[PDB]
Symmetry: D2
């Protein structure tokens, strides 16, 4: 609902299509001060262009590669100095090598399996640890997952095992951080046409199947994830932790 | 989530401790016009008194015993004649005989088992059928469930089987009514002291074990249910249907 | 396994294609003594001719409509008098009105909803209660379910809610009867061509989708249900109760 | 379930209390030929002493540290030259640093998190890939898991997220290897006093809660896991893949 005098860190905007930019537009439109973290330079320039469409009167941008403890630790330390205590973190970060996102899961390399774990699951653990320091009176942390973490979805392969790892991460952090009044939840988004979606074998087939087979008979967009992000990030969800909310036209519920 | 020019029907207030009155207070605070339904004379009296705390310019109160098709059908028809189209329904209704909330589940009577299914599960299906008539543009329907529908909880017995039935009822309605743009969901509430809670053996023990074991280390209340009802019943949740949101301090996620 | 000296009651053989006759063949091959229950006189006729395929040296056949308490009570009592104590019960019984297995779930009548609960779920509870008397040292009870109890499968409709209720019944019975050393479990069978299948809309379409999509890329048969039954009814599974084993080519595991 | 003329590779015996020695006792009693893999020389020494209680007329022992692709690859290759084609693999391997099994999850180190994933989840993927070479006509692969993979259990911490990973690995392997007639399943064992259990904080208090709260009111042992292993590794479970069978006295089904 209304989020004036709230402050949220959004990680993982790459471009206009990022799920995280959908989150950002909804939080922005609701009055939140926003901070953004990015990995690569291109995502920075992009963010600077995208910020023109938002009502943020100023550009809070931090480079953080979640493969580096130092960058996560220092980035959050700096956010603390620049902006003060924050009210939550939206985590929208995942990665796996393309060669792993097709053909045969049983052929996945150790290096690729461990990389997807590092970036797509462990990153939440360390982000939660550092972000907690900026949440002395509690807060909310939301990560993004896909139904592939709950069932085996053809092609999603190593990323489905990373997402399953992430969803359990979310539950273990909810149990750990709960006494500190920090809630930790996931949004299981339906398929959405993003930069990262280009890397997944058979994406287009899945989008069509949703339209044919999901209860709502349509696909979801980034703003729909954003609205559910706003619920999860706000006092509207005050009793909810350890949860996975599927923003997916009801596909999760059918077989 | 501003709800002005929305109208919701709330089924199942008995007194100020009813979960559904937690829902009312929140929706009322957000500007919803509300319509209430009740079974017992005593519940209408309490409703009349409770309406003084709310901002409803008008008392809209209908007697509906969900054991009666004619009452549900004529109730919602009369609702549409008096207020027009509605945007959703909050179902907060269950019932079982007391001896069926303690002791050995295997001694449950047939009449007892069917009574709990009828009021606590079938009622949602018929309410959805009649309510659909007043939602030509779509809407949202939310029922109230307990974790005993997902796992065997000592003493919850016949009501656990009825809630497992209700939760599937929510999924099958979600699938059936999705093409009509009517979303159907459940809130799985943690234990709250209400009139119905006095019928369940070992209720106090469970309350204490939530405080000691759940991530948030505290129990939830009716208003926290209400806040997640407001998310579910508004456009904030637009891509979400067939879902069970646990408002239970994270207890569902641990073991 | 090895089942000489064991006695099992098998409920719900109607003809040679019944899931329960796949169970009977497997147990009979394993040396078990079998007792059979039936509702229609036609089912008894088929049973008498199917017994010719089996090494049962004695027909023990009992009419039990699980809608009648009297009949479940007297039947199990007579079984006890004729064969002595038993080791477990296979329950293969369900029923819904045909018109409820196609079209719109929201149009389900109260009478068809409760019929399905009564036959397909409540029946297990009273069977368990009566069978218990014949298992002073413990035993095993298995019921047959389908994935539509866990997810909303188009057309399965009222029977999905009755299976959700059955699967919770299994968990509550497991909890209640476990101290008596009676294990209670479910087999979630994949689609199999049976007399009851003839009543479900879109059944052939689902058979095809299983071949195309399930991990094993084929459908299962009654004998494969029987072999998992043998496991569950024997000491091989002594540690397992409240469980739902999917015998379905892995279809449950995928999306 | 006679297993004469079958061959199984059992990975992860360290001593008489290993879960995998439970499996081995059962498979060996059923007439299988068994091949064992180990990491520490001390484990080889215990295996030589334990083999004297088994009926195996020869010791087939191979050193395989699952952190090394070379040792997995050359290990299975050598196994195929010595005993020819096999019927299945029992995977009973996990590891985590002791500090990661008590205290706060959120303080987990990147290196400790990825170590646990590497040994406890990824190992199954590469083992399945190499073992597949020895199962041209199909076979069965079973891994060992814990309820901590499905819910946040206090103290299980980094291993819980490694088990979420493992259980998803099992589903993705099931889907991938299904067309080759290789089944992949998990057993979710209840707590058992083993060498690895000594490293987990609060293990004793959980053992006691199982006796008090689980449906069977008792803990399980390694032979019980072995019996379900024999079901999963044999033709009795032919229609069953991507499944997780809880051998835990029913504790998974209750809250
Ligand atoms: N699109 C879908 O259908 C879908 C569905 C369900 C869930 N999801 C999840 O939604 C989230 C966002 O993905 P998206 O679809 O929005 O695609 P996206 O726009 O490509 O976003 C991926 C983001 O992850 C960031 N990232 C990758 N590795 C990083 C690292 N090591 N450190 C910091 N940032 C890193 C990328 O940053 P750089 O480009 O700056 O490297 C990029 O901003 C992901 O968790 C994804 O798994 C997506
Ligand atoms: N309290 C909890 O810890 C808890 C936790 C999880 C879920 N729930 C669920 O929350 C919902 C509301 O219960 P509550 O705890 O708030 O208790 P409550 O205040 O006692 O409300 C239950 C309501 O059910 C209504 N009802 C029963 N049979 C009915 C019938 N045949 N026709 C119409 N209405 C009928 C009652 O109306 P009358 O008084 O007029 O008869 C009463 O208004 C139920 O679904 C319950 O299972 C409760
Ligand atoms: N076929 C499938 O694809 C499938 C998949 C998953 C689960 N299942 C389940 O498997 C079980 C057996 O069904 P099936 O497929 O084998 O079909 P089936 O051969 O038609 O068997 C159904 C049995 O239910 C019995 N029954 C129905 N109402 C009864 C009553 N009131 N009292 C006593 N018995 C009654 C019938 O007995 P009478 O004929 O004597 O009336 C019949 O023997 C059911 O629980 C079913 O839902 C089936
Ligand atoms: N005990 C329980 O209550 C319980 C419950 C559920 C699941 N589990 C699971 O059961 C499985 C067996 O554990 P357990 O309790 O039987 O304990 P255990 O006797 O200590 O066995 C664990 C085995 O893991 C092997 N291992 C560890 N790292 C390895 C590596 N890098 N390469 C090859 N082997 C490695 C160890 O071999 P070395 O000693 O030679 O290093 C040891 O043989 C594990 O997956 C565990 O998570 C245990
Ligand atoms: C067959 C699967 C069909 C739909 C997949 C839905 C889906 C889920 C994601 O988590 C995702 O983000 C990444 C995916 C891979 C690597 C990095 C990020 C993108 C994406 F489109
Ligand atoms: C061991 C039980 C642990 C706490 C149970 C939580 C709980 C759930 C309900 O669904 C409920 O409403 C009814 C219950 C029974 C009959 C009618 C309504 C009240 C209630 F307190
Ligand atoms: C669209 C779903 C297609 C797959 C259906 C699988 C299936 C499950 C049953 O439980 C069943 O027994 C019934 C007994 C009585 C009434 C209905 C069914 C028969 C049956 F084929
Ligand atoms: C919260 C306490 C709950 C009881 C834990 C049950 C349990 C599960 C295991 O997976 C395990 O094996 C490893 C555990 C850690 C590292 C390596 C192996 C041993 C173990 F006793
Ligand atoms: N006194 C009742 C209900 C209250 C309680 O259980 O604490 C019982 O023995 O079941
Ligand atoms: N082929 C389906 C379609 C039935 C229907 O039209 O409902 C059947 O009759 O089993
Ligand atoms: N091994 C101890 C751990 C004690 C501690 O971590 O302080 C236990 O069983 O709890």
């Amino acid at each position: 609902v209304n989020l004036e005098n709230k402050t949220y860190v959004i990680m993982g905007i790459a471009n206009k299509r990022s799920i995280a930019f959908g989150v950002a537009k909804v939080l922005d439109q609701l009055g939140a001060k926003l901070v953004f973290t990015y990995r690569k330079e291109r995502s920075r320039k992009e963010l600077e262009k995208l910020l023109e469409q938002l009502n943020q009167p100023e550009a809070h941008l931090y480079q953080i590669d979640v493969q580096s403890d130092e960058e996560v630790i220092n980035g959050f330390e700096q956010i603390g100095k620049d902006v003060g205590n924050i009210d939550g973190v939206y985590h929208s970060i995942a990665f796996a090598n393309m060669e792993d996102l097709r053909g045969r899961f049983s052929e996945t390399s150790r290096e690729g399996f461990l990389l997807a774990q590092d970036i797509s699951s462990y990153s939440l653990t360390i982000v939660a640890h550092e972000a907690k320091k900026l949440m002395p009176e509690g807060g909310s942390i939301v990560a993004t997952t896909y139904l592939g973490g709950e069932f085996a979805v053809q092609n999603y392969n190593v990323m489905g095992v990373a997402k399953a790892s992430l969803e359990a991460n979310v539950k273990y952090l909810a149990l750990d951080l709960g006494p500190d009044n920090i809630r930790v939840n996931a949004i299981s988004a339906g398929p959405i046409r993003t930069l990262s979606a280009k890397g997944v074998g058979g994406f287009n087939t899945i989008l069509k199947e949703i339209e044919e087979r999901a209860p709502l008979k349509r696909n979801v967009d980034q703003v729909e994830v954003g609205k559910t992000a706003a619920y999860l990030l706000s006092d509207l969800s005050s009793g909810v932790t350890g949860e996975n909310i599927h923003v997916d036209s009801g596909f999760h519920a059918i077989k």
